[PDB]
Structures are given as structure tokens and as C-alpha cells.
């Protein structure tokens, strides 16, 4: 039962073209008429944003289901959520949200069913604009180190509170982004990885003593000869070794440097770069330390193991590595955790479903295998000394379960510790299945399909498909309240496509969708839409596609290549200028997956799919005269420092020019708009802000797909 779609005439605002900007890339001339949009501070760019906001508001005013979606999302997400607890000393800590708090509150308890005490409430600062990203509790549970944002930048300030009375220490550590705070077992301070004072280059590893100014922090590592190398760090569970991981770019590969803290004459004060044991000193493979017994370390690695494995090495004999748990021939070893003193919990991904294995740490022998339902297990935080492991399970139809596995007393049983419940939602009316569909080259692409049980496969249903496809990221079918609104009140079918470029089948899956093979990602996604149409879930023009960042690139490339397949396209903070992405903020870190236009071979890949360079009028191709672009919403925060908004702005300007304003009477009737969030960064928006964005997104989609509300 179709509704009316977009019909009001659109007044696209004037956008100036700089016709003089032309670059030569290895003999190919590329015009960049919206180069000036790369300056966010100019009056012309600010005017562009104001004008696009005005246009978007006029279009969204005609989407009459926005208010209905908004209230239903609010109602469906209005349930208490307890994060996975973790233990320090004899205290437990976790995040909590009563349902509609702007941000999660960090709580402490004396026991798992004892009275929670609020340690830090981000809702009290700036209306909960930002939540906590860095949170770290000392070994004695006396101190809590956490990161606060000051303004809309990605820079974090680390503060420390005493858990006993919630009083702040005077200590303030600036120039941090994503660093952890890694405590020594003496409780005297912590390792962290700041950048030098005034860009994010020349990252350092430092140690901060409690009660001192940042200027007194001990330098452990820097490398002025490699300014773009970035750092992660870790301390072993016994407190004896500090591990520094050095990474280059976005690749899953790192060095491993090991510092023996017990051999230092006067502790870390001895360094008032330090003498690291350079166990791995190349970028050939990934290595994450799982456990050690003295100098004998157990690592997870992808070395000669695209699906990963566990290996063991003695630091005293560092050339000799031995497999502990061999690489599986089919399943990805996603993570491993030492627990209950002498065991390992392994999280495998087997055809995009989790399987947990409990193994003996010393021998690697399998003890128990726990297959998990469709969804995702994550947040295993238990340490080697802990006998009880907690983790979180979520799925499309399961809002959130915190499971407990007591390895001492009842190791085969997952016990429910906390269970979230969606109000006024009957899970049993819906189902999720996994199917495998062929890509253009024959490759099996897993997809998850969620819908009401017993629907007719008559092509009548609106369909939303989501994907990412890059950077070895695994796309799991997790819970979204807005997705349930779509299924229930729009009679929708939801599809999550596990396309190449992700990590789901290991490094070979990732490499089959990066660099020269990035086009495979788009073909995979297109093939999934074709399957949904051929099998009768939906029809072309009732399919909506959505993705963010690298997934926004996915959306923009697919609508350029196959505009006929889609009725709605929503690209959140997409990477749209593939020739220039490497020049802005941290875009240079992505050249591993994408390539870079400064090399001819790589330019040739990039130009073929770069969204702003491939906008073409589909109706000018013979036999395609009835085709237009789908209704398109480009979403971005106005101060996204991860993916700069110029990408979105240049695509928007290019689409509006090619399809609408360069012609006096264009066949393009579907609107091409941007929803620009004012005063927002990349990082985690407050509950109501996020709900407002998602309601706008679904209202626009409902109108674009001509899908009526049910209820």
C-alpha cells in the first residue's frame, strides 16, 4: 500500500564553482570546482552550510513520520542498561543508563548485588554532550583515571578521582587522544601515551606519578625519525612487564617492545628511550600479548595465519616461536583472554557467528565449546586472576544480556547476570536468518535478514541494507531500537551484508576488498541488493542503503554505479574525495586500505570509484532514461575531525550541480540534501541528539520509499 512521495518543488541554493582549479594526476586532468569548501572558516563555506540546512529543513518538514519514528525510538530505547562489570581489588565497576540518560554513568559496588555508588556522571557536564571514552581503575581500586573532552576537538584531558570520597586529584594530563591509562601494581601512577604540547605526530610513551604535574612525567619512548608511528601499551597481569606496541597506519600489524619493570634499580624513577627488549621490530604481523609465566609469553598473532592463532615464545630465546593453538582452517580467532589462573577463553568468529572456547593455558587443549546465537559477544574484560568471566550479548532482536560464566564452579553454563527488555515489543513476531548470496565473481557473501515472521515474498516490503566493507572490521548483527521501529511500524526488512574488506573471514577477506580490489566491496553490496530483489523481499526503488565513514563511501559509490537499484541513500560522514582524503587530519592513516593518489597505480584505482569524481546523469545512458538518483541524505557533524566534513560538502555540491542545477528542467526529482549536525564532533552524541538524527533519517527514508506507517 504505497503512500505519496516527495512532491514539493525544491529550491536548490546557489553554490559557486571555481573553474580555475584543475590538477594533473599523471597526465589526467581533474577539475575541483568546490575546492573552496575545504576551508571551514570562510564566510562562503559557512553560508553554504546555512543554505544547505535551510534546504534540508524544508524537505524534512514534508516527512510527516519523523515525529512518529522519534516517539517510538524513545519508547523502545527506554530501558535500563547495565554494562559488563569488571573487578579491581574487591570492587566491581560498570556503566549504567536508566534508559534515556544523555550518557552512561560510571558506578562502583562492593559486591555484584550491592548498592551502586556513582563515581562519575558525565550528564552533569555540558548537558552530557560527551560521555567517557577513557576509564581506568587502579589495581587497589583507590583511583579512577578518566578522559574528558574540552570543546569539539578529539583532544582529551585525563583527570583522576579517589574512589573513597569522589574527590579529584589536582593532576591533569593534556594532549591525549586515545591513550589508555595503564596502572603499575604499586598504585603509584600509570603509563599513558600523549602527544607533545603546542597536529597529532611524535606520540610518546610516558609514566605519570600520582601527585605530580604532567611536566614531571618520565619519558619511555619516542621516535622523532618516524613521526606518524602511533602507540598502544599494556602491562602484564603479574605487573612485571610494560609492553609497548608500535603501529604504522591502519594495518593490523605492530611491533612489540618489552620492558622488565622488576630489573629497574629505583623503579621508573631510574629514567629521570628506555632499554626495551625489542621482541618484534618490524611491521610484518599483528601481535597481542595474552599471558605470560615469567619470561614465557603467549601471543595472539596473524603471522603466517590470516585467521590468527596463539603462539608462545620465551623472551630469553626470542627467535623460537611455537604454536599453542594452531590457526583454524575456517574460523577467525578474534580474541583470547587468560582467565581463572590457568585457562583461556577464545572468541572465534565462524561464518559471522561467535563461538567461545575454553582451553587450558599451558597445553592449549580444548575443554569446552559454547556456540553463540546470531548476534555478538563482546566486552570480555576478565583478567587472569578472575574466576568469573562476564560478557555482553546483543542481537537484532535481543537488546542486551550480560552473561556470567563461573569457570571454577560451573564452567559449561552461561548464567544470565543482567537482561535488558525492550518495552512493548514481542520478539517472537520477528526472525533473523543468515543466507549466503553470490557476488559478481561468485564469492559467497553472508547476509543477515531480519523481518516479521510469515511475510509474503511478493516484492512489496521496504528494505534497509547496511554495510561497511573495510579495515578488517567485522560487522555483527547487534541491537538497534530504531531498526525495531522500522521492522514493526514500517513493515520493513533489514539486511546486514558482510561484504569483503571486513575481517569476517580473516586477512584474505580484508585484502580481497582493499587497495586494487576495493571495487569488490561495492560489487558485493550491489549483489546483496540484487538478491533481496530476486528473492522477493523487496523491489528496486523500495531499497534503502545506509553506511557511515568508510560505509558512507560504500553508499556513495553504489548509488553512482547503480542508481536504478535504490530508492533511498543515507551516507553518514563518508569519505567522498578519494584523491585528497590523505591530506586532512588523520586521513593519511587510511592509505594502507585505499592507496594514495600520489602514486600512479593507486590513482588509477581511486579515480574509478571516488564519489565526487563519478557523479553522472543516469538518464543520459541509453535504455536508462527513466532512472534518477535515489533520494539522498548526506549526514555529517559540522566539526567531525575523523572524517572532515568537506568530503560530504563537496559530494553534496557535485550531486546538486550534475543532477539538478546544471539543467533548467532536470529529471532528478528525488531530493539531494544534507543533514548537518551543528556543534557536534565525531564522538558519542547524547541520547536525544542521536535519536533526533535517526528519526530524521527514518522519516526521510519512509517518504523516499513511499512506505506507510503501521500502527
Amino acid at each position: 500500500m504505497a503512500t505519496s512521495g516527495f512532491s514539493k518543488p525544491l529550491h536548490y541554493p546557489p553554490v559557486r564553482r571555481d573553474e580555475t582549479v584543475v590538477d594533473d594526476y599523471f597526465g589526467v586532468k581533474v577539475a575541483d570546482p568546490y575546492r573552496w569548501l575545504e576551508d571551514p572558516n570562510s564566510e562562503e563555506t559557512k553560508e553554504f552550510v546555512d543554505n544547505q540546512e535551510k534546504l534540508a529543513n524544508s524537505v524534512l518538514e514534508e516527512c510527516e513520520l519523523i515525529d512518529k519514528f522519534k516517539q517510538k525510538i524513545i519508547d523502545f530505547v527506554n530501558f535500563p542498561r547495565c554494562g559488563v562489570p569488571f573487578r579491581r581489588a574487591n570492587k566491581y565497576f560498570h556503566f549504567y543508563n536508566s534508559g534515556l540518560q544523555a550518557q552512561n554513568v560510571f558506578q562502583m559496588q562492593d559486591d555484584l548485588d550491592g548498592k551502586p555508588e556513582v563515581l562519575y556522571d558525565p550528564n552533569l557536564r555540558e548537558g552530557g554532550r560527551s560521555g567517557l571514552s577513557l576509564y581506568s581503575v587502579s589495581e587497589d581500586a583507590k583511583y579512577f583515571a578518566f578522559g574528558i573532552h574540552s570543546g569539539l576537538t578529539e583532544w582529551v584531558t585525563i583527570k583522576i578521582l579517589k574512589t573513597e570520597d569522589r574527590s579529584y586529584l589536582p593532576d591533569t594530563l593534556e594532549w591525549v587522544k586515545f591513550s589508555p591509562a595503564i596502572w603499575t601494581h604499586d598504585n603509584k601512577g600509570f603509563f599513558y601515551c600523549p602527544y607533545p604540547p603546542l597536529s597529532a605526530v611524535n606520540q610518546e610513551a610516558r609514566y605519570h606519578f600520582l601527585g605530580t604535574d604532567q611536566s614531571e612525567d618520565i619519558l619511555l619512548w619516542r621516535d622523532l625519525e618516524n613521526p606518524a608511528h602511533h602507540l598502544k601499551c599494556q602491562i602484564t597481569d603479574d605487573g612485571k612487564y610494560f609492553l609497548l606496541y608500535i603501529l604504522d597506519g591502519c594495518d593490523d600489524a605492530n611491533k612489540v617492545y618489552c620492558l622488565d619493570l622488576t630489573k629497574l634499580p629505583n623503579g621508573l624513577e631510574s629514567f629521570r628511550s628506555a632499554p626495551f627488549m625489542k621482541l618484534i621490530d618490524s611491521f610484518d604481523a599483528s601481535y597481542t600479548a595474552i599471558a605470560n609465566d615469567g619470561s614465557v609469553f603467549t601471543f595472539q598473532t596473524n603471522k603466517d595465519a590470516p585467521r590468527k592463532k596463539l603462539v608462545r615464545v620465551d623472551l630469553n630465546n626470542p627467535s623460537v616461536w611455537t604454536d599453542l593453538v594452531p590457526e583454524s582452517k575456517k574460523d577467525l580467532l578474534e580474541s583470547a583472554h587468560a582467565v581463572n589462573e590457568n585457562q583461556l577463553i577464545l572468541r572465534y568468529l565462524s561464518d559471522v557467528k561467535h563461538v567461545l572456547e575454553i582451553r587450558d593455558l599451558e597445553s592449549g587443549a580444548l575443554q569446552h565449546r559454547l556456540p553463540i546465537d546470531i548476534g555478538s559477544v563482546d566486552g570480555i574484560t576478565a583478567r587472569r586472576r578472575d574466576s568469573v568471566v562476564f560478557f555482553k550479548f546483543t542481537s537484532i532482536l535481543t537488546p542486551g544480556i550480560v552473561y556470567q560464566c563461573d569457570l571454577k564452579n560451573d564452567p559449561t553454563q552461561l548464567k544470565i547476570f543482567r537482561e535488558s527488555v525492550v518495552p512493548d515489543f514481542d520478539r517472537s513476531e520477528f526472525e533473523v536468518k543468515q543466507v549466503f548470496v553470490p557476488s559478481k565473481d561468485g564469492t559467497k557473501i553472508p547476509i543477515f535478514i531480519a523481518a516479521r515472521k510469515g511475510i509474503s515474498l511478493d516484492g512489496s516490503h521496504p528494505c534497509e541494507m547496511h554495510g561497511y566493507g573495510g579495515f578488517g572490521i567485522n560487522m555483527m548483527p547487534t541491537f538497534s531500537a530504531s531498526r525495531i521501529v522500522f521492522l514493526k511500524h514500517l513493515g520493513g526488512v533489514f539486511c546486514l551484508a558482510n561484504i569483503r574488506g571486513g575481517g569476517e573471514y580473516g586477512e584474505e577477506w580484508h585484502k580481497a576488498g582493499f587497495r586494487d580490489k576495493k571495487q569488490n566491496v561495492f560489487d558485493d553490496f550491489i549483489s546483496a541488493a540484487e538478491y533481496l530483489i530476486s528473492s522477493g523481499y523487496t523491489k528496486a526503488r523500495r531499497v534503502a542503503i545506509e553506511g557511515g565513514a568508510n560505509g558512507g563511501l560504500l553508499v556513495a559509490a553504489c548509488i553512482n554505479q547503480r542508481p536504478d537499484l535504490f530508492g533511498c541513500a543515507e551516507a553518514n560522514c563518508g569519505v567522498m574525495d578519494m584523491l585528497r582524503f590523505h591530506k586532512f587530519t588523520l586521513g593519511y592513516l587510511w592509505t594502507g586500505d585505499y592507496g594514495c593518489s600520489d602514486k600512479e597505480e593507486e590513482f588509477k584505482w581511486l579515480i574509478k570509484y571516488s564519489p565526487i569524481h563519478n557523479v553522472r546523469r543516469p538518464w543520459e545512458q541509453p535504455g536508462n532514461e527513466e532512472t534518477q538518483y535515489p533520494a539522498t541524505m548526506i549526514l555529517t557533524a559540522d566539526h567531525d575531525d575523523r572524517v572532515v566534513p568537506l568530503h560530504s560538502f563537496k559530494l553534496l555540491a557535485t550531486m546538486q550541480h550534475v543532477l539538478c542545477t546544471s539543467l533548467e528542467d532536470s529529471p532528478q526529482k528525488n531530493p539531494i540534501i544534507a543533514r548537518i549536525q551543528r556543534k557536534a564532533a565525531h564522538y558519542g552524541r547524547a541520547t536525544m541528539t542521536q535519536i533526533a538524527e535517526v528519526a530524521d533519517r527514518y522519516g526521510f527514508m519512509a517518504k523516499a520509499l513511499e512506505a506507510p506507517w503501521i500502527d
Partner: peptide, 18 residues
């Protein structure tokens, strides 16, 4: 504990599974 995937072009301790 600190933010994962930090170098990558990706979006999403989220306040709510919206």
C-alpha cells in the same frame, strides 16, 4: 580501557543502542 578502532574511518560506551 580506551577507545578502539581509533585510526580508522568508522563511526558508531555509546549512551543508547539507537
Amino acid at each position: 580501557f580506551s577507545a578502539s578502532y581509533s585510526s580508522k574511518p568508522i563511526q558508531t560506551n555509546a549512551s543508547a543502542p539507537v
